[PDB]
């Protein structure tokens, strides 16, 4: 329900027009920060493994439903669909596309 794009390490590079109303953060507040900054304590470990698998496989990877910390430091429940694209000349990830569903 909002799209973001991340670096190979998870740093926010882009959020769409629909994100701020959901998570409360202005783009200048969240761009440049890692998505490990916002994951709930109980979800970060499973999300790291999802992140690892995305960086390995050519395929889409869907996360579990997890809690994402909003600007007011409360949490909303997201489920993200992640896919990484690697520069064929350098093998490094150009970006990770993220479809972030909201509940």
Swiss-Prot record:
Q: Which domain of life is it from?
A: Eukaryota
Give the record's keywords alphabetically. Answer: Biological rhythms, DNA-binding, Nucleus, Repeat, Transcription, Transcription regulation
Shown chain mapped onto the complete sequence: 311 to 412 of 413
Can you name this protein? Protein cycle
- State the organism named in the record: Drosophila melanogaster (Fruit fly)
- Location of the PAS domain: 2-58
Q: What happens when the gene is disrupted?
A: Cyc mutants don't display PER and TIM cycling, and are completely arrhythmic.
Q: Where in the cell is it found?
A: Nucleus
**Domain PAC span(s) in chain numbering:** 63-103
* Gene Ontology MF terms: DNA binding; DNA-binding transcription factor activity, RNA polymerase II-specific; protein heterodimerization activity; RNA polymerase II cis-regulatory region sequence-specific DNA binding
Task: Give the GO terms filed under biological process for this record.
Answer: behavioral response to cocaine; circadian regulation of gene expression; circadian regulation of heart rate; circadian rhythm; eclosion rhythm; locomotor rhythm; positive regulation of DNA-templated transcription; positive regulation of transcription by RNA polymerase II
Give a yes or no for keyword DNA-binding in this entry.
yes
């Amino acid at each position: 329900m909002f799209i973001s794009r991340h670096s190979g390490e998870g740093k926010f590079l882009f959020i769409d027009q629909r994100a701020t109303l959901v998570i409360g953060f202005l783009p200048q507040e969240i761009l440049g920060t890692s998505f490990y900054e916002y994951f709930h304590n109980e979800d970060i470990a499973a999300l790291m493994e999802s992140h690892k698998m995305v960086m390995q496989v050519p395929e889409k990877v869907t996360t579990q439903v997890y809690r994402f910390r909003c600007k007011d430091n409360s949490y909303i429940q997201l489920q993200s669909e992640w896919r990484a694209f690697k520069n064929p000349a350098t093998s490094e990830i150009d970006y990770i596309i993220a479809k972030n569903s909201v509940f």
